[PDB]
Structures are given as C-alpha cells and as structure tokens.
C-alpha cells in the first residue's frame, strides 16, 4: 500500500533491532555444514559479487519423506520447484 | 482476474469511477506520485483511497471528492418578510447539485442574496469574520462602537457636577425543572419478556 | 515591626483562554459518504444528526458569547492621544503600532507569532487541496472549522480602546463617562486605595517610571524567549487538533466488520447480508461522534468558566482597582 | 385530522429551514441547512 | 560492493518472499525491502 | 461464501484465485470450514 | 425552552426503528418467534439506552452550568443586597 | 462514597451479560466455535 507523510503501525513479522545474529563464513580448500533451523522464518543477507551461493533449501526432514522446496538462482529462468528431494549431507 | 464486464473510458477532472471493482465518486487528476510497480491502491491518513494505478495504462491519478459545502441560510421573521439569503460557507464564489433550488465574497464564505453597503451598523445576525446582516437583506460590518476621544492633558481634569441614579436589571437562573425516566416502562412496553432481557444489562 | 523603605513596580502576566476552535460537522457525509442507502438506514436512528448539529450550533454560539462578553465590555471606542506623553512611563511597547498593516502592539504580534493556529476556517481555493494534509483530509470527511466572529482586527481595536480609555481616565470611563485625567493623577488615586500616600508618587515619580520601563522591558524579553508563555492557549489548540484527528482516524475501526470501506462492503456482499455489515459501522461512527459531542461540551464547558473568570478579572483589574489579594496578580494591585 | 398546510423542503431555503425545524415559523437568524454536493454526471469503468 | 537481503516467510502454507538490493560501502541506515515472489507452498 | 456474496461475485477482481480440490466423507462436510475442530480440519486440511 | 425540546427529543427518540423491521414492540412480539425476535428486541433496547444516557449526559452538562449560574447568582445576592461591594461592574454598570 | 459506588459498579458491571449466554468469556470460548462465539464477544466488548 503506498503511504506518504503518514506514521503507520503494524504488527507483524520483523527482525528486532540490535539483535545477535550469526555470520556464517564457509570455505573451500579442496558432517559440517547442518541445515539451520527455519523457526518462524529467518532473515538472509550477502553482500558478494560473484558466483558465490544463490540459493535456499526449505523443508523439514529432508530425506524424500515429505515435501521440501529447491530455490536456485541462476542467469535465466531460474528453477523453483517443491518435491520430494533427496538432499545430501 | 476479474469478472467480465466491459471497460469505458477514462475521463478526467466529477463522475463515478470504477478501478477494479473499487466504486466512488470523485475526480481524477494527475499525481507526481513515485508509486512502485507492486502498489496498486494508494491510501491516505484517513484510510480513503487517494490514488488508484488505472488496470490498462500505467499512470496514477488522483482522486478527490467533488465540490461540497456548507449552506448557512439566513432568514429574518416569518411575520416580517420571506426573503432569504444564501451562504455557501468555506466555498468562494468562483466555485460554487444536491438541492433543486447581490453576489459577496466574505472570509467566512460566499454570501448570496445579500447586498454589501459601506455604512456600518450593529450587529444583528452573525454572519463570520466580523460581518453581519439585517432587514431588504443587506450585508454590512459590524461596528465596535460610536468613536470617542478623551481630551488628554498635562492639567486638565474633568468632574461631574451631578449625577442620574439609573437601576439596572439582571436575570441569573437558579434551577430548572425535575425529571424522573423509569427505564422498565420507557425502554419496554410493560412487556415481561421485555424486561427480562432489559434486566442483563445491569444497573443503567 | 518592619516597614519597607523602598519598593519594586513589578508587571506579572497572566494567560486566560476565550474561546476555542469551532467545529461543525455533518452526519451524512462523516458517516454515509457518497451512499445512498447508507443514509436510509441512518434516518432509522432518529434525529441524532440534528441533536449533534443543534450540540455545535450551541457551542459556537457560546463561544461567540463568551468572546463578545470578555472583550466587547465598553459602548465607545476611544482612541490613544496623538501626544505619547504620560509623565514619563512610556506605552509604545503596548500602543498599537500604525506602521505594520494590523494595529496591534509588539507584544501582540509576539503573542499572535507564538500561537499556531491549525485551522482558522478561511477560503481554500481547492488549490491545495489537491496534489502536494490532515485539514483537507478532515474537510472531506465532514468535519468543517468555522472562523469566529470578532476577527483580530476587531479583537486588537477592542483592547487599544480598554487601554486608552483606562490611560485617559482611571475607571471612571468603565462606570460612566470617561473623564479626562492625567496619568500621575491616576497613579496617585491607585496609591492611595492601597494606603499609600501621593507625596512618595510626586517625589519618585521618575523611580517608579523608570522601574515600570524595566518591566516591560523584562516582560518583552522573556515572552520573545520563554515559549511556555502561552502553553495554556497552545495545549487547548494542541488538544482540538488531537481531537478532530482522532474523529478523523476512527473512520478507518471496522468495529467487527470485515472491512471499514462501504464501497467493499456493498460491491462484496449482498444487501441481505451487508446490511448488518454497515450497522456496525454505523453504530460505532455515532458512538464516537457522541463522545466526541461529550468532550467538545466539556471543553466547552471549561471554556466559558475560563471566559467568565477572564471577564471578571477584566473589570476588576483593568475598568477599576480591587482590594482582592492575589487575584489581580501577586502583590497590591 | 386534515391536511390544511404543506411545505415543499425542495422549492427554497426558507422552507428547507422550515423543515429542518419543524416549524412554519421561523424568527430572525441563521441556520446552517444541508450541505450542498456536486452529483456525478458520467459512469468510469476501469478494467484489464 | 551490493548488499543483498533476503527474507522469506511461511505463513498460513503461503511462501513469502521479500528482497531489496541497496549499495553499501551491516552498515547504519535503513532499507526497506520490495515483495518480489509470492507461492501458496502449503509445506512445513 | 465467506466475504463474498454468491450472486455479486462477477462484478470483482482477484489477484490470485486458486481452485483446490479433494473427496472427503459425507460427514465431514461441516468440518471445512472455518474455526472448526476434529480428524479432518487438525490433520487433513484446515483454513484459517 | 432547551428543557421542553430535549423531553420532546426523549419521547420522539422511541419513534426510531435502530435497524429492525418496527419501532412498536408489541407488532416485534407478535410478528417473529423469539428464536427470530431477540435479535431485534436486543436492537432496541440498545438504541433506547444509548438515548437515554445521552439525555442523561445533556441533563448533567446542563445541571453543571446551573450550579455555577446559580453559585454566581448566590454570590452577587450576598454581595450587592446583603451589603456593599466595591467590585466594578460587579452589581451592574456604575459605582454600586 | 460516590467515587467507591462509581468503582462498585463499574467492577459490577463485568457480570452483565449484555445479550449473551453468559458473562464470563472463557465459557463462551469453550462452549462455542469463533465463528459463533465473536457474535457473542463482540456484544460483551461493546457493553464494556
């Protein structure tokens, strides 16, 4: 809704101000990486230029026993599609 | 998605307009609003719709109620004449339907019927902003009071030589008439079955 | 037993409100905003609309009364002689000034600067109503400010004629005809209703002008500094408009509806059914115009207890000299 | 119980405020009657 | 140098999604986020 | 039809309308819907 | 005048419908089961008691502003008749 | 005296039931659905 010149309060979703949150910083040199939990939602922030990760993984016990959701963002047409997927550790 | 039903064309600056099922009245005009393209709807601090994105062009108009206004009639006695005066109060006269039915611009409003004279006199029907009309019906600004000056001075003093005993007159009410309303046989026609859902309201 | 060898002419002000904003407001389109049926079933409440329009008409002429009764107290203007000459004391800081386009004095101008008024109740072009408020927003919705009846300009020639009139004769201009009388004179009679003989007046008559200039002086200076001056005007303001914003705002309760838009309500739902979709916010509107009516009446109520103390201390202290203590200032008026 | 008097609330002012007030006799002064509003002349049908 | 946030919310089996990308020199300031992707999932 | 009339339902917009679709028992027709409890709404299919 | 018209207002107030199908109660009563007829009696009693205590409100805003009248006129009575007041303008216009 | 029967009555006032089948609100919650008991909740908040 567009709104100008105008305090308007809401009750909803939000990320509280000043709070802890947790930087994660994963490397590669060439079991460690858990799937975080999604309690109420979660707030995603980056800030790389490059190929580094573009995508989210959605479920809840993911080992193809309920539905889970495969975001992957690429150069075009992106795929997102709920399935019964099999992820790896 | 919407229903079927055929679209007319867009006219702007008063007629009922119809932006996706959302019906009004008011005008349209154009807006130097930075809508986003997610917005559609627009909404203001009263919680009216303001400005609407049209369904087929991307523009964003704007959407104000028509022209409207108080009307402030002012009549003298029935017994001495019927004349009236008509008083479109915070609307100018360039300006200025729902009823079926000389000229002055005043700061209170448009004052037709009336004819402005220069003489002032006392105030008889206020009017606004300092003017004030009487019995034809004319319009004219009231006056503060006869103008006096005092002969001031250094030495000059002024005492009077008598005097007039006058008996002035002053009413100041004291009371008014009593008044006992049983809500049982005011609110219920003596109905039991009345009274019966008039007694969980508690002790009103 | 102490007896004081000197004394200090001190000036204390004193802020007293009038009058308030009027405020008129039309059932039918506060409520049934361009709806037809919407009013058909309001007409099924009665004349609460009339009671309402009668609770402001009421109001407003009160006001207008009380304005008329503390002001307008004198039957003759009298206007400030062209010599500015009283003995010494000089009025030019309370003398309306001819060079600015209102006659009004600088602490007038001050007063009426530090003041901001929400709405007056003037002509709008319906220029600005449009394109780049909280007034428009309230006019469309109903609620429509009134100007009053005495302008500034009646209001500031009212108080240089009370002034005159009491430079130029003492009280006898407020109990009779005013009688030509020099300013020492004057306050020699005042210094001797307090018991306080003329012989100190005639001998530090230049003391006691020069102490009153300070005064002004010291009284200009904390009204152009001290904004709290007149927080008693500016907190009724501030609530008049808290209050036509929260009328304003309580458009926008569903009171249990499904939404507090008629429009939706009448294209979503069938009459059947959207009829006791709008008696809920039908009801909830007059309820809150009726305690909206209540307040007004109560402030309404204050104002004019306000206005007769006012008019009271006017008569007392400025048409004449009252022995009261404490009530025309602190210390022997 | 017969009609003797009518007043038409649509012909003029003075017998809207006659109306308003629920009297044919109105004494001297000014009554605020019903607010004036400008009716729609065209329909605006808006749609994909 | 862009920061790109994201949020996603799962109410009432409706997925949302919103993200707004703002240039930065976590900086002081505030940047609202645009509604982009709205999908009825109906997934835990 | 919760908030929308059967009849003036032509006359509307949506931005997303989706047409679900199951076979439930005929007993279990008063258990979709709104507010309502039992096997159905708390393990099946529930609305808000 | 204020006292007659606000009694008239009360006693008209009973004309208004306040949503159901007839003011008079007794055609409510006879016309709907009370399974159909609580819905409308419940209307009515709301709407006559929101009427009466806005009477109520009006007699008491009236009843405050007699008081102080009436406090004003004791206190004009005690000073003028039962003595002398030097106040101006207190006991009308001119040296009392 | 009148501002304890003011606060007597107003804490008084709780146990009127405004219309509904009673005046405690835990009872209509258990006894009723929402979509029959706001009905309720609604009168028992405007009495209030």
């Not at chain 1, 190929?51 to 993984?57: E, L, V």
């Not at chain 2, 006869?146 to 009410?173: D, G, Q, R």
């Not at chain 3, 048409?319 to 203590?325: D, T």
């Not at chain 4, 038409?8 to 004036?36: H, M, R, W």
Request: charged share 15%; glycine share 6%.
């Amino acid at each position: 809704v567009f709104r100008s010149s105008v305090l308007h309060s809401t009750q909803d979703l939000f990320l509280p101000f000043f709070s802890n949150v947790t930087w994660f910083h994963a490397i590669h040199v060439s079991f460690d990486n858990p799937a975080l939990p999604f309690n109420d939602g979660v707030y995603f922030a980056s800030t790389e230029k490059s190929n580094i990760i573009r995508g989210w993984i959605f479920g809840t016990t993911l080992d193809s026993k309920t539905q889970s959701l495969l975001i992957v963002n690429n150069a075009t047409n992106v795929v997102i599609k709920v399935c019964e997927f099999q992820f790896c550790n | 998605v919407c229903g079927p039903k055929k679209s007319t064309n867009l006219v702007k600056n008063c007629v009922n307009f119809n932006f996706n099922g959302l019906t009004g009245t008011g005008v349209l005009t154009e807006s130097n609003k930075k809508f986003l393209p997610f917005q559609q709807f627009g909404r203001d601090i009263a919680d009216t719709t303001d400005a609407v994105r049209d369904p087929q062009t991307l523009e964003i108009l704007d959407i104000t109620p028509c022209s409207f206004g108080g009307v402030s009639v002012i009549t003298p006695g029935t017994n001495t004449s019927n004349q009236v005066a008509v008083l479109y109060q915070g609307v100018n006269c360039t300006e200025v339907l729902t009823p079926t039915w000389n000229v002055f611009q005043t700061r209170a409003g448009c004052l037709i019927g009336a004819e402005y004279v220069n003489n002032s006199y006392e105030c008889d029907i206020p009017i606004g902003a300092g003017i004030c009309a009487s019995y034809s019906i004319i319009a004219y600004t009231m006056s503060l009071g006869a103008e006096n000056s005092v002969a001031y001075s250094n030495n000059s003093i002024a005492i009077p030589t008598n005097f007039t005993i006058s008996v002035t007159t002053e009413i100041l009410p004291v009371s008014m008439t009593k008044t006992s309303v049983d809500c049982t046989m005011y609110i219920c026609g003596d109905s039991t079955e009345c009274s019966n859902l008039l007694l969980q309201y508690g002790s009103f | 037993i102490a007896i004081p060898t000197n004394f200090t002419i001190s000036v204390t002000t004193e802020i007293l409100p009038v009058s308030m904003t009027k405020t008129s407001v039309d059932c039918t389109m506060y409520i049934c905003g361009d709806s037809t049926e919407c009013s058909n079933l309001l007409l099924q409440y009665g004349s609460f609309c009339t009671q309402l329009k009668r609770a402001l008409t009421g109001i407003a002429v009160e006001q207008d009364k009380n304005t008329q009764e503390v002001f307008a107290q004198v039957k003759q203007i009298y206007k400030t002689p062209p010599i500015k000459y009283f003995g010494g004391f000089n009025f030019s800081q309370i003398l309306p000034d001819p060079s600015k386009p209102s006659k009004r004095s600088p602490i007038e101008d001050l007063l009426f600067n530090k003041v901001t008024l929400a709405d007056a109740g003037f002509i709008k072009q319906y220029g600005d109503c449009l394109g780049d408020d909280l007034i428009c927003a309230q006019k469309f919705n109903g609620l429509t400010v009134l100007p009053p009846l005495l302008t500034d300009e009646m209001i500031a020639q009212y108080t240089s004629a009370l002034l005159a009139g009491t430079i130029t004769s003492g009280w006898t201009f407020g109990a009779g005809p005013a009688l030509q009388i020099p300013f020492p004179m004057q306050m020699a009679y005042r210094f001797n209703g307090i018991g306080v003989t003329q012989n100190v007046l005639y001998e530090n008559q230049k003391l006691i002008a020069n102490q009153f200039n300070s005064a002004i002086g010291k009284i200009q200076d904390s009204l152009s500094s001290t904004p709290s001056a007149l927080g008693k005007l500016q907190d009724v303001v501030n609530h008049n408009a808290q209050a036509l914003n929260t009328l304003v705002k309580q458009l926008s309760s569903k009171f249990g509806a499904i939404s507090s838009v008629l429009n939706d309500i009448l294209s979503r739902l069938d009459p059947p059914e959207a009829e006791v979709q709008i008696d809920r916010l039908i009801t909830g509107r007059l309820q809150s115009l009726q305690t909206y009516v209540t307040q007004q009446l109560i402030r309404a109520a204050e104002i004019r207890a306000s206005a007769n103390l006012a008019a009271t201390k006017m008569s007392e202290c400025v048409l004449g000299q009252s022995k009261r203590v404490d009530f025309c200032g602190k210390g022997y008026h | 119980g017969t009609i003797t008097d009518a007043v038409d609330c649509a012909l003029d002012p003075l017998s809207e405020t006659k109306c308003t007030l629920k009297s044919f006799t109105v004494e001297k002064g000014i009554y605020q009657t019903s607010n004036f509003r400008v009716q729609p002349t065209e329909s605006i049908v808006r749609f994909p | 140098k862009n920061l790109r946030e994201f949020v996603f919310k799962n109410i009432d089996g409706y997925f949302k999604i919103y993200s707004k990308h703002t240039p930065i020199n976590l900086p002081q300031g505030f940047s609202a986020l645009e509604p982009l992707v709205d999908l009825p999932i109906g997934i835990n | 039809c919760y908030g929308v009339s059967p009849t003036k339902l032509n006359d509307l917009c949506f931005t997303n309308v989706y047409a679900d679709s199951f076979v439930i028992r005929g007993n279990e027709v008063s258990q979709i819907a709104p507010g309502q409890t039992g096997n159905i709404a708390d393990y099946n299919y529930k609305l808000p």
